């Protein structure tokens, strides 16, 4: 009789998304992102915005009855960056603090086995 | 509010894994929970503390009035465990 | 004008200005308590002697600090209330006797209006006007970032006193109101947390900016 | 609000664009984080034994 779900965190260099679903992941419970909390695009990937979005999502999950969550951190992966953005550990800490028990913590970034060609050309970004 | 229309079903592991409880899932219609996949660990399924890196995937195949039983679909090893196993030299 | 017994006042006990005692003055802010000096002192005039030593201002009486902050012009390179206050030949710069008289009259007005200890009212005003957080730029990588930082008690007290002095100057600038009356009104408003006080308004603005930055 | 006082116990070093901020380690005097030692940036002159009124005890300042 324990309510355990899964908290998927999408962390990038432009935004952070916190999405709380059931144990099977087929039932959305709460979904919050930085852009729905902060007013500026530059502030979207900030750890403060991640913490606020995580707090709102945790409050919604607690209201709906979820008491524990399994963390699933994810960078964009694929041909894009494979490292999580700044607002991932902050979101995890906010989830732990807001009143949700924390279970397994794993990284589920999609790692290609020599997949598609990344964008930017053979010379990359030249800034 | 569609949330008040959702009922909670209890997910049951396959018979050869002991048939123990693994979680609860909300659903409006019982057919919508007839194909969901849940990921668990052998540590939770059996109680072995050493084998916490093994992940089992159970897919629901039957609903019997708030009791959704599952079948075995796949087993995987933890990515961190594999990365620790693989090294240079 | 002034009574002779006041023009030739002769104190007999060690107390601030010979009229008010700090024994009953209480500071309930743990951060600012060790840095507000309330030791028994009659004349608040140390002739400097504290600028040389690091953290030397922690041993200077709060009344003398207020007198020193008042002893100024009001504004030279910044704008207070949207105006410059460049008083060159008619400022209180290096006029400690004039600053002392102004502070004494302001304390008398505060005592008459409130009914409590003027030093206690000043302590309340400083506590209610001391900000707790600020913002600053930190250079990491190759560019800067604005982040929120805490404020040391020393800077808190300094900012509170400077803001009170600036508010008094603005209230007394080019109006029928005198400097002592303006200072008394500013101190009373800051103690009562009224937003019209310049120090309290500046504290609220700084805290809001810090909250936005963090 | 009233913040939470915390006592400074050790100083890391100087930090900032113009080097006007100081990083210290503080111990929460009271609140939900009783006894926890965290690290924060400070503006203004600071010395061991000072008390800072943190508006919150959540984000710890990173390494130098």
UniProtKB/Swiss-Prot annotation, chain A:
Top-level lineage group: Archaea
SUPFAM superfamilies in alphabetical order: Translational machinery components
Region (Disordered): 106-127
Any single GO BP term: translation
Protein keywords: Ribonucleoprotein, Ribosomal protein, RNA-binding, rRNA-binding
Transmembrane segments: none
GO CC aspect terms: ribonucleoprotein complex; ribosome
GO molecular function: rRNA binding; structural constituent of ribosome
A Pfam family that the UniProt record links to this protein: Ribosomal_S11
Function: Located on the platform of the 30S subunit.
PANTHER family: 40S RIBOSOMAL PROTEIN S14/30S RIBOSOMAL PROTEIN S11 (PTHR11759)
Family indicated by similarity: Belongs to the universal ribosomal protein uS11 family.
Assembly and oligomerization: Part of the 30S ribosomal subunit.
NCBIfam families attached to this UniProt entry: arch_S11P, PRK09607.1
Listed name of the protein: Small ribosomal subunit protein uS11
Naturally occurring in which organism (per UniProt): Pyrococcus furiosus (strain ATCC 43587 / DSM 3638 / JCM 8422 / Vc1)
From Swiss-Prot, chain B:
Oligomer and partners: Part of the 30S ribosomal subunit.
Similarity comment: family membership: Belongs to the eukaryotic ribosomal protein eS1 family.
Name this protein carries in UniProt: Small ribosomal subunit protein eS1
Organism: Pyrococcus furiosus (strain ATCC 43587 / DSM 3638 / JCM 8422 / Vc1)
Gene name in the database record: rps3ae
Range covered out of full length: 11 to 99 of 198
Swiss-Prot record, chain C:
Domain of life where this protein originates: Archaea
Chloroplast in keyword set: no
NCBIfam families with a match to the protein in the record: PRK04027.1, uS7_euk_arch
High-level lineage: Archaea, Methanobacteriati, Methanobacteriota, Thermococci, Thermococcales
GO MF, any single term: rRNA binding
InterPro entries: Ribosomal_uS7, Ribosomal_uS7_arc, Ribosomal_uS7_dom, Ribosomal_uS7_dom_sf, Ribosomal_uS7_euk/arc
UniProt record similarity statement: Belongs to the universal ribosomal protein uS7 family.
Protein name per UniProt: Small ribosomal subunit protein uS7
One of the GO BP terms on file: translation
Complex and partners: Part of the 30S ribosomal subunit.
Recorded name of the encoding gene: rps7
Pfam family, one: Ribosomal_S7
Main function: One of the primary rRNA binding proteins, it binds directly to 16S rRNA where it nucleates assembly of the head domain of the 30S subunit. Is located at the subunit interface close to the decoding center.
Database matches in PANTHER family: RIBOSOMAL PROTEIN S7
A Gene Ontology cellular-component term: small ribosomal subunit
UniProtKB/Swiss-Prot annotation, chain D:
Pfam family name, one: Ribosomal_S28e
A GO molecular-function descriptor: structural constituent of ribosome
Source organism superkingdom: Archaea
SUPFAM superfamilies found in the cross-reference section: Nucleic acid-binding proteins
Name of the encoding gene: rps28e
Entry GO CC: cytosolic small ribosomal subunit
GO annotation terms (biological process): maturation of SSU-rRNA; ribosomal small subunit assembly; translation
Subunit record text: Part of the 30S ribosomal subunit.
Protein name (database record): Small ribosomal subunit protein eS28
